[PDB]
Amino acid sequence: WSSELSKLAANAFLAQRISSINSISALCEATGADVEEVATAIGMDQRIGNKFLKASVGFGGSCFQKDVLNLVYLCEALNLPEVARYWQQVIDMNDYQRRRFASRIIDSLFNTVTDKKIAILGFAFKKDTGDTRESSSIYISKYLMDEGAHLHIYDPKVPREQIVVDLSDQVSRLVTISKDPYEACDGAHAVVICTEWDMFKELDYERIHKKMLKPAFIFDGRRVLDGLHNELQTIGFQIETIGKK
Amino acid sequence: FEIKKICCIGAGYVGGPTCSVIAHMCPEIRVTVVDVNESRINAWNSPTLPIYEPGLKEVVESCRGKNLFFSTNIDDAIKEADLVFISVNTPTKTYGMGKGRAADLKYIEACARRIVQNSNGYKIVTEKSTVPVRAAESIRRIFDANTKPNLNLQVLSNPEFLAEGTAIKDLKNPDRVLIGGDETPEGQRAVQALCAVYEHWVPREKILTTNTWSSELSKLAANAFLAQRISSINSISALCEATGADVEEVATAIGMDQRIGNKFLKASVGFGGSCFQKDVLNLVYLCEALNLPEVARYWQQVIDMNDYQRRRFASRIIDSLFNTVTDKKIAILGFAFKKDTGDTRESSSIYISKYLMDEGAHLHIYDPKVPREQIVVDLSDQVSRLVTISKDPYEACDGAHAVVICTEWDMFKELDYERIHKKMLKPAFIFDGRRVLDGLHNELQTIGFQIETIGKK
Amino acid sequence: FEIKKICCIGAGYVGGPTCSVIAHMCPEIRVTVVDVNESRINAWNSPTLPIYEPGLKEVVESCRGKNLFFSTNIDDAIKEADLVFISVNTPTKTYGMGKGRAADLKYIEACARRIVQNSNGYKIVTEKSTVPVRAAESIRRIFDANTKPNLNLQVLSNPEFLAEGTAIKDLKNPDRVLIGGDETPEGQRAVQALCAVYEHWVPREKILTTNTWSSELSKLAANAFLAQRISSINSISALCEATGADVEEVATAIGMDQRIGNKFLKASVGFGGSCFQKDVLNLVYLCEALNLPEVARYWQQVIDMNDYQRRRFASRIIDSLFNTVTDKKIAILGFAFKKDTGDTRESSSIYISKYLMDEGAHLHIYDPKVPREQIVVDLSQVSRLVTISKDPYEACDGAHAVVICTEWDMFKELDYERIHKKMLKPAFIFDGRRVLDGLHNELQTIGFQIETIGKK
Amino acid sequence: WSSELSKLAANAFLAQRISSINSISALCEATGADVEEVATAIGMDQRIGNKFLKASVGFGGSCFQKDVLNLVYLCEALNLPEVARYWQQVIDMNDYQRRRFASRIIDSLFNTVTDKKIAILGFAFKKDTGDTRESSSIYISKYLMDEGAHLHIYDPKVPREQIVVDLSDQVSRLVTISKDPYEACDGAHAVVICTEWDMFKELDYERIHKKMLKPAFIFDGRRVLDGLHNELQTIGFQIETIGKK
Ligand SMILES: O=C1CO[C@H](OP(=O)(O)OP(=O)(O)OC[C@H]2O[C@@H](n3ccc(=O)[nH]c3=O)[C@H](O)[C@@H]2O)[C@H](O)[C@H]1O
Ligand SMILES: O=C1CO[C@H](OP(=O)(O)OP(=O)(O)OC[C@H]2O[C@@H](n3ccc(=O)[nH]c3=O)[C@H](O)[C@@H]2O)[C@H](O)[C@H]1O
């Protein structure tokens, strides 16, 4: 039991680190601070550590949410409701972060995305995997699909059939799986980066902007385009990223 | 800058009549109304206009083919225009954020993109609607993001205050004209150019100029104030019914206060139209986005009261008929949302009809101007079984248990109610939701009707 | 029937001015205003009237002692009257059913019983108030149950539409006169008699006659419609401050619609007065009693919005002072619920003051007409935190903020350069009435931070 | 246990009969029927029986409310919440009956009883006892005291000191204990009969009316003045009784 509880707790502590910094990212957006700068100051405390302080659209994977959900469930079964609602906030914050990002996209596109093309760059739950389990891209995609958006989804490693399954009628009408990222962005109103694949930092954003509809939005849900902000603004993109506004 | 050619995208209740009057008052300006809807444009070019507005036919026929034109060629109309009106529909969102509350700007945005694509040089682009909801701000962003060399588009807000059924009189003698534009030299140059158009027939002192947001918020607020006047008097009508007073007498006493005024104090089954509910819903939605929940719930009461008014009216009908109306014939006199229009959008007749259809009633609906096919659509198996559209009001009442007057058409007070009573089933009810059969109450009671009206018991 | 002698029980803001104007306009009618409050009656008989109403002193002094009399002898005034007005106060019930919501009819009933005791023959008894809540019905119930041989009391409803501060002009040129009486020959004879009084100066076409309940309901509704306009424009003022618009410009555009009208569209810290909140509260309470909860919650929003408007102004002041105002001096300019009156009943200044006192502020309150002792009573912590200033420069001397709560014309003419010199910095002006509009540039140049309702 | 459960149930069945007929009394008042006539028709069914069908201001005594409360509590402890709520209605209806009667008194007196004299005739929980435990007269008295009424209470058998105890500063200001019923009614606005003492049928109501304030109300919470309604109305009383209106 101590072995299992230790695993259950360690995963939940990690997921907390993400929800805590994601919560600060929302406060940063609301007050003119930059979550990456705040995270750096936080992480230099050796008692906190500097890992797992990368604000994001939200953590995914088959571990963290499942782990916290089971921790909450175990506590509820043990009549520890105070403990249950403590850890539940880790999930609620992750869900809020995804929802907040999705509605920021919708808000920027004039409160309406029906029949608008939107490129989704990144579908795996993190870079360097084909795993999509609990990927934030699924939730962001579903929020945009529920708003009538036509998604063009590119991921360098997730298989096409997996993406259709993850997003499943409505998938047939609204979801396209692209072979390359330039095809996903061709004629798009907005590009939403959901997974921090290194190849996204190196895309030809000059070429992408030319063939996008204007105003051309990039929604960087992973902070992967930091330092390109100047170059991207000069190209003419309106860049919105988590934890900065 | 002098506006000599006007293009209006949208040949509806706003765009059509507004541009027809401009052409009428500005003989030296060429006014071309365009629309994607070919059958609507064809009707504007025909002896039977696509909407019913008193005096509109006379105005259109004095101008059409001289300086007033109707065309489906949107692109070429834009290309030659000095001023482009955008008077398209903004339906309520049916899904997503603001489903059934926020309006859908997708047509405004599509028009803005089409204007830039088809424009060179200097043009003024003016959003004109009864409920402008961030319309000018959206057009501005598309434009700011889609520049061309030597393309110089100015965005104005110019809300339309006309009410349907009195559109022509309202357009020829507006209480005020409201124009919003940027507080820049170019914005003010654009504002003045549009003012110069209206100054052909509107005194300068009745033209208000402001910035674009203040123009749209004034319209949103003005619409909401009017809708409130109705919900307030309708709420008093419920109090009158409960206490033995007469809302029409109470309204007279209220309206003699010059600080309140005596207009828009006519209690009714409930306000309808494409403006008021949409306007308040969008105001509530706007206040929730700005974290003003107290303001949101303040204005929500205007809608809640209107919905209650309709429900209370319907349940009075059902109660009067012993709580069972299955297979009972009921005449619905009036389907338009007000008199002197064929427009049925958000008409209380729809809601009253639907409440009775849910009780299994056989409705026979007569309206002098709403097209039959429109009534069928508004009420849409159940419509096929339960709804009949009558070609005259005596056919609708023949064998009816009850006559429900939902629209204050003047012809309804002139009906031969002795003849109507003879062929109705007894007890024969008249439910007046427009307080129009007033002064006929003694006659109707002598004939043998049970008369029920809003705000009087 | 000809009314030659009028008695008015109640020498307040309604009874005093109304009867003074009647006497002024009807030199052949003897009008006696009576009251249990001897000091109030003494003031009416003095060079310093007990209420401040523009033009009232001139009206009173032209008639008093000729056909206008003020007396504490209620019983004898009733005995000789052809017409008895009842113009007493109806406080909100402080306990029981309708605590804080329902009007307390205890004084109307006591007046009705006293009238029966002291009456013989025929008299017209007319309830006159700004917020009549079943008043005529309760009087009639007493009269029906307390008959005497040859005693014939008729009950009319005659709501009073005057607004304080413009009472005299309103009474001499009313938009309409509303009289309710029974729909019987006796009731109609009484209605006509009262009409004949008003017809000395009011055209007949401006006199509405109806039954007693419709008369009272019309007043309840008319007051609520007015209060709703204020809450509506105040709600828009919050939306304006949140979106960069100016409620005064929006109000102008709205008010040019002749179906809306341009009156009562002045956004403010919130409406006050003994009428509006009481009226809406009683309307809500009435609707709940009639099982009209939808109507009740509709009108409740008028009060809820007014309360929020006050709370939002107070929190703007506290926020501007960086959320600590403990021991900070704040000038309150204006304590009356509107200009040109000394009346403070339900004044927003009370509520704003109390919010600041709850933050530990040291309030220095100046009002040109509200008596100092009234301000102390209204705010009763008062000893520790509240000072009543003799002039506005004393109130602002060393203040962090100046809060204008009442639109007294003198406030826009103050020497604001002098005021700024002696204030602590940053020096804020919080204009809760839009009275400093057009001075905004000058005040900013002087160095003030100006905050006003409906603008940011 | 079966003995104790049998007692708990029998009391609760009796208290239910009262709440059931009291509930019908409210319907009778609202629809123009007479609960006494309806009760007669009901009680002639030999399966219902004709006892304990006397509508009233509400049942009192140390048994019924305590019994139903304990039955409800027992059911809650046994995890029988459906049974608990079912029997709770017996108490809720009794409380509503008292409130409805009290507010009818206040309503008839123009919504205000401050400084008004109300005679309370009957304080025992039923006739022919000095017992006041859970007497409805206590609750009615407290409702009127909370509205500022000056109560003058007469009961032929309840000791003066018990009434003071049952109603307990506010008692000192508002409560008078009268030595005879004519003293209690002297100058009263209303007479509230809460206990069905047979002597209340035999009072000189002509004499009482002469000295009462007008309009003079009698609130018969026990139906003890039935058949005197014509004479009392001729004398000039406004008579309000439970289950008729
Ligand atoms: O800008 C603008 C666009 O919106 C509106 O025009 P509308 O064409 O909707 O017509 P309307 O006269 O207000 O009638 C609205 C509904 O209220 C109902 N209505 C109207 C007046 C009344 O007193 N009682 C009542 O029930 C009508 O019977 C109808 O159902 C603005 O008035 C206009 O200034
Ligand atoms: O019958 C009657 C008795 O009740 C009322 O008279 P009042 O003496 O209460 O004066 P008032 O002019 O309405 O002002 C009320 C409050 O609203 C505030 N107020 C008034 C107008 C405005 O536009 N904005 C605003 O905030 C005032 O600043 C004040 O705080 C009826 O108007 C009268 O017809």
Residue numbers in the entry:
A (entry chain E), D (entry chain D): 214 to 381, 389 to 465
B (entry chain A): 2 to 381, 389 to 465
C (entry chain B): 2 to 381, 390 to 465
Reported in the publication:
To our surprise, the cryo-EM reconstruction showed that Escherichia coli, expressed hUGDH copurifies with a nucleotide sugar which stabilizes the hexamer in the EΩ conformation. Single particle cryo-EM data was collected and processed, revealing one major class corresponding to the EΩ conformation with a global resolution of 2.38 Å. This cryo-EM structure is similar to the previously published UDP-Xyl bound EΩ crystal structures. The active sites of the cryo-EM hUGDH EΩ reconstruction reveal density for six nucleotide sugars that resemble the allosteric inhibitor UDP-Xyl. Two of the nucleotide sugars are located in the disordered NBexposed domains and have correspondingly weaker density. Based on the poor fit of UGDX to the density and the unfavorable steric clash, it is likely that the gem diol dehydrates in the active site and that UX4O is the bound form of the nucleotide.
Human UDP-glucose dehydrogenase (hUGDH) catalyzes the oxidation of UDP-glucose into UDP-glucuronic acid, an essential substrate in the Phase II metabolism of drugs. hUGDH is a hexamer that exists in an equilibrium between an active (E) state and an inactive (EΩ) state, with the latter being stabilized by the binding of the allosteric inhibitor UDP-xylose (UDP-Xyl). hUGDH forms a hexamer arranged as a trimer of dimers, with each chain containing a NAD+ binding domain (NB domain) and a substrate binding domain (SB domain). The active site is located between the NB and SB domains within each chain, which are both flexible and undergo a rigid-body rotation to open the active site and bind substrate. This remarkable conformational change is controlled by a buried allosteric switch (the Thr131 loop/α6 helix) that responds to the identity of the C5 position of the nucleotide sugar bound in the active site.
